[PDB]
Design a protein around this ligand. Sequence first.
Ligand SMILES: CCCCCCCCCCCCCCCCCC(=O)OC[C@H](COP(=O)(O)OCCN)OC(=O)CCCCCCCCCCCCCCCCC
Lengths: 49, 80, 183, 117, 105, 137, 155, 78, 506, 149, 119
Amino acid sequence: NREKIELKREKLWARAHLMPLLQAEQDRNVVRRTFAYYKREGEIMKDVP
Amino acid sequence: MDLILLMLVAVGLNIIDIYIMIEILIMGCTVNTIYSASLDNDMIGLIYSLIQIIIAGVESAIGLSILVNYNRIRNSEEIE
Amino acid sequence: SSTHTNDSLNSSNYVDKLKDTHFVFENDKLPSEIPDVEEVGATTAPLLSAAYFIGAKCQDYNDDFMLCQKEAKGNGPIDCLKEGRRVTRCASGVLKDLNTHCSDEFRLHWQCLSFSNLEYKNCRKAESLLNKCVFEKMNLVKKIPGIPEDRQIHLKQNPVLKPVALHQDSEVAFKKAQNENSI
Amino acid sequence: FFLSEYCSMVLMSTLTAIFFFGGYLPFSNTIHHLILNLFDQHSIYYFIIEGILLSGYLAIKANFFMFSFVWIRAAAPRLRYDLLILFCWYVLLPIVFAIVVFAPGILYCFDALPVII
Amino acid sequence: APLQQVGRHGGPNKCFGEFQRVVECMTNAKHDSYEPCNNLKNDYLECRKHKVERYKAFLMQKHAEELGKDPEEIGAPFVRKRRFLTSKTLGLVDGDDYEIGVEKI
Amino acid sequence: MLQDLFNNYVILVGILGLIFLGVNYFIVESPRMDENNGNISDYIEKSGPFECGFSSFNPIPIAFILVALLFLPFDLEVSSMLPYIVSIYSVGIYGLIIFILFLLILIVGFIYEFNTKSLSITTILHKKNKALVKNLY
Amino acid sequence: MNLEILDLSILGFYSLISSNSFESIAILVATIMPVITELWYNYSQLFALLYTLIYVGAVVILFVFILSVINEKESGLFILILVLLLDDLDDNESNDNDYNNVYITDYADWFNNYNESDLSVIGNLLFTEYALLLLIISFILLMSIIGLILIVKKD
Amino acid sequence: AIGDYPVYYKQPIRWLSYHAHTRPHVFYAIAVAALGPVFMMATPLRRKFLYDDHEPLPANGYPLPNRSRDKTLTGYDD
Amino acid sequence: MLFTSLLLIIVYGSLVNKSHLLTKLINRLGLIIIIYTLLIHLNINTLENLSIGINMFNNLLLINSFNNTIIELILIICILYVLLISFNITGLSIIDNLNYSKRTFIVIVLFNIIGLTLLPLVNDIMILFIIIELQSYSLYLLTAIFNESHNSTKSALYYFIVGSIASFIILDATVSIYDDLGLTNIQYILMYIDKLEIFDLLCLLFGLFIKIGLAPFYSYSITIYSLSPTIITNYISLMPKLSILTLIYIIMHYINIVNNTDLNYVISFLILISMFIGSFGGLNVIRIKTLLAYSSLLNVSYMLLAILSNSNESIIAYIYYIIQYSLTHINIFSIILVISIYLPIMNNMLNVMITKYSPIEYINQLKNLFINNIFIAIALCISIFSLIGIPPLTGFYGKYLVLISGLNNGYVLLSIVLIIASSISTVYYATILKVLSFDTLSFKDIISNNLIINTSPENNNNEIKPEISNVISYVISSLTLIILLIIIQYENIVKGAYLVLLYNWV
Amino acid sequence: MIPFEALIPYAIMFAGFCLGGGVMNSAITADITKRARGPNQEIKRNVGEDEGPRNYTKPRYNTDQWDKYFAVRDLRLTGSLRGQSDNAVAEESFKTNSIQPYSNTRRPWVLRRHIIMKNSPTKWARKYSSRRDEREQEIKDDYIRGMGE
Amino acid sequence: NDFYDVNDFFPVQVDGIESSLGKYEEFAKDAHEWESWNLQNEDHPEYPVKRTKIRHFTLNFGPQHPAAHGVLRLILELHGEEILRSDPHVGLLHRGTEKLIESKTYMQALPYFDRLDYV
Ligand SMILES: CCCCCCCCCCCCCCCCCC(=O)OC[C@H](COP(=O)(O)OCCN)OC(=O)CCCCCCCCCCCCCCCCC
């Protein structure tokens, strides 16, 4: 159980190093889908002044 | 439809059938809480649901104990 | 944790039927005002194998990328788009290096992870070779912050928890290095 | 109904193997290692042998308890029901609650509280 | 003060930030009334149910109906069966349309 | 974690239930084939109870009732130990002390029902003995 | 074909016609099973299993336990189907049409590197944050043990 | 008193012996259960004589450096 | 102090041998525990400091000067009730030994006081449901503590079912509130007091209205009170209203922030209907406990008008009324537990079956109490005269203060009906006084030796033999003079209620 | 004197466990590996001549929420939930195939169709009273009433 | 009798039942509907309850039982589980050996005895 604690710590730091990389692509996807939503809404409601 | 109180037709004619309707009624409350908690990703709602399930169990045990002693009270000659 | 969510793939297609889930695509790419970046193409196992070398090489940018998220005060995705590309480029730099310096040492390790449930405890023999190679050719080291150097888990000579089944390519490659290197 | 009683016997014998005798883990790691070194991990023949071995270890452990289901039946007279309900409440339950307050104490004393790695 | 809106991993969930900004405004000392915090209250309710945003989706559905805009060309492509998230659909270079494996990971 | 393999198993077991019932209904020989004396319905002699041969026609002990009734409070005690199992590390000493307190209060109930001997069946109706006492005059 | 509707229609049919207490206890089991199964899929697998462990395993078999103790003694097809059909027509529990016709998603994020089950968080809060709620519950359980014995025990 | 039931506040030692002979199902369940909290109390003894407690886990999200953003950070630019 | 001593009483009672003297002595241990609780409570809790309101136990429990008033009152009334079970109410072994036949009686009562005292303090919907069950479960057990009795068990079964439906309504309102807001703490809900369906708090009130016996739900309370033993009815018909009415007042305090009129009309519909049934109902009744059940409903109707109005004068009206009504209720039931010694004994027609659970059951069993004991008859007369509202007793100031709060908030219709309903109810309070005294002069010189009190043994024939025990007599006299002579210190008491605050401040 | 006739059933029960385990270990491993070879069926079946030894992938257990995000991320890269790839640069199709699932948030069927579970003081007001819905509809209306400013 | 069957407190004399609007006999013809006007308490020990004489649970531990190592019909009358009365019905193996011995000489009567106790 003391070995699992260190095996747990090794894995959490491994995940912490990958977090900025995997979140940088997740922030881009959220931005990309957010711009596509507002592009579609402007397209549909362009005739409304 | 239920505004004419249809659920009264769906409850049997024994005291034990009332006890079950109370459980099925409360079961709806817990299912409503689990529904909201999961959508909100809120564990506080899941703490509430866990309490409701545990409290709804204690209510059943007391009610059955009263019903059990109610039953033996009639069958209490025991003069054999 | 296998909890159902509204944000990714669920356990079974019966969850999808109840939720009436639509898996929606968005063809629209990013606008040209945001300069493009080359996304990392590595899968799960290679990233977990090179995670501590991305941490050693991109430490400044990862900290700065996160510090932008802390100080953006809720507008993190939009106000850290430029700082989020340095991290993507830095991490692509490391995976490109491992492919051009330690291709076989790297592949051996993450084939072990794909063979042993993606657990670091099961792949120490392959991992030790990869760390030794990376140090001499890129100077990167694996360090677990918060503990003394003498008490890091991956340097434990006699671990309590060991793999049940051996990786043949790891055991064969290990003993070869016991001749090539342990002169 | 008869099949159900024997599915439970097989199951509860397997569960005792899982909880106390390591499940599918080998009796000897060396014998497990030596046997598997005779097969190449790049061919599907390796994985059949490992699956046969790993289920074999469980089967031998499980068989010992399916044996003990029968063995105790041939050696112990049937226990009276009134003395049977009082056994689990007045003897087993206090012990089982005594341990459930004992194991967390020993683990905490030596800073060995478990975590899912 | 007690924690409300705790995520399934022990941290703040999606809508905790909005609720916290409400508490800061209501318990603030520089406010004479609760008027300035009225917008923050709407955002917390909005974050949870999206009622105003779902309403906006209803008009954009209804406005396209009265103009004749084709749903397939204004909407976004979607797939209902997870087994048919094929590499042809995902856009991979030499991807087949054969179904993908969603049996066991 | 995918569970489409699990779903097929549950579906197959559901199909296996219909097969067990009907395989008897399609393999047994026709009642005419064996003896023709009747179906299970009309043959009320065959469709009846077993009373070892002789035809005949629940005031259970209160101790049995208290065994079942007290099962429910002691079950909710056990099921509410579940959250502590998967969080024993992250609650630390604080959650461990609370857990022990959560168990002490329930144990005071165990003491109470151990002293009253509530589960004992007892024998109040019978097993009486007396002293023969002469009453000389 | 959301077959969960057909399970309750059968259930709603037998609730209107049940006579003895055998069928009344059957309505209980026939209601938890749709509740458990509709929780296993969709919303919460953890509380589907907690319900089976706590309701079926603990409070349901107590009903049949006392039914054998209590006793076992002792309409028209047009009206039932008419009532069930009338009950079937209007099944919208809420009248926010957009909330019931418009779908939503969530965005995942990688900020949570310490991923653990819900039962880990619930224990984390129940044994720390709301330790009063946990302690009162053991107090309510304690009163029941005393409460059961005083009600039922004869002498 | 060859067989009398002991009084706890006058004969503490014999009172436990009566219960360790006639009620083994109570005496040793209490004895086992008390060995848990007893072992918890001896935790400070282990700290000073055997080994310190481990370092706590990094289970609070990404470790954010406690400083201001770097200003000269370059490289990997568009 | 309450909880810790309860465990000691639970364990100790299960050890010692079943006997009446030990059961009565353990009942005197609880009387100490309740007394000790009051001394510790009053020591730390002060009106001057609890004025702001203080959060406790992670904001689950919130305590202020309004709640703190009732906790001390609840503890006081629980002392006067335990005096009955802990000492002799008559001294005749046949009648009294019922109070000592149960060892868990005092334990269940101590369970309820923990339930009663925590209910006004709740500040979370999660703990609201838990605490309301702790109080609700304790009442069902106390109703069925005499498990041999057929009527008692039949009442607990009726009580459990109605309360279970009542608790489900309470649980469902909280779930609906959580569905809209996702918050459990009551203070956090107050931030969205304008953004939530205010009628879901009314659905919460409909559950609490069942538990206090308010019409149209009044039917079960009248049945329950007229079947339980008089010692049991003395507790279950007063205590739940002490802690629930305090909770209802607080919930209405938060509700009137948005001042929704539709909410007030429905509650006025229930208050108006209850006064009608509470007044016209008791006109045709023979059982005294059924009479005091209709009397209880009418007073709860008055106390809701003070709750519904909910102003600065409503705190004074409620705080004063809830105190005087408790003492009046204790005084009346204590007398009914005593005057059973004057019942005649047969040596016939109408075959009236009396049991040891309700020896005094009919109003005409109070006949000629002016003859058998004049001093205690006036005490019952003064108590009934307070319920009528004859000044300058305590009862007048309750109605006078309630009327001020009611009319100051425009409840003209309800104020007039309560004054009509009060006069209609005076008919059946006057019947109790008619039975007490009106046939005095015909029965003045009668040869009475068949009373129950005449089966008491003669001790010495030289020493004086008092007819009534010491403690019960001192309680009856004290509460009769407090009811009668409130005019002396009324000004100080009312000025002592101006200070009880519920977030008034400034 | 060991009876072999007595141990015959055990050797058959031992084969029962081995039969089930041997199939599961090999079939699931082979399927996972094959689908992790490429994005089409003409790649999965055939083995190239210039391809090296095959590295099987064992089935994965004890996962968490990151493995559900990693699985979809691997799907968008290789066409498999457990694909293998270590290219430092992803395909240009990676930036236009993110799968975001949209699902409804309606109450369970049992909560709104059961003959008994649907009856409640507040569930009728949600179903038959317009008080709540008219109040909320004001906020939706005032969204489009404020676009003029 | 055969089919059905029917104090610890002072016999209390209650006379003159009256309510606020009148006396009992003035409303006694309507009091059958008012259940709070029932003068008959259901807890009085003299309350007449015509309860049927349900026989005790009588199990037939009949011959077809492994315990009955012959032909036994054991009739058990029990309260709950504790046995009140038991009525063994022997004779299911009565073959009249005593009647048959009288018609046979002493040498022929001997085999009749090996068949009394089989073991
Ligand atoms: C794997 C399948 C297991 C179930 C097999 C039985 C299926 C038959 C349909 C019953 C179950 C439907 C669920 C609704 C309960 C209805 C119970 C009822 O009303 O009685 C059914 C049964 C037969 O009697 P019946 O002729 O239908 O009615 C008039 C009899 N006087 O009256 C009886 O009590 C006879 C014995 C039946 C005991 C069944 C116990 C209750 C069911 C629990 C198991 C299934 C759980 C529910 C799953 C489906 C939920 C929709």
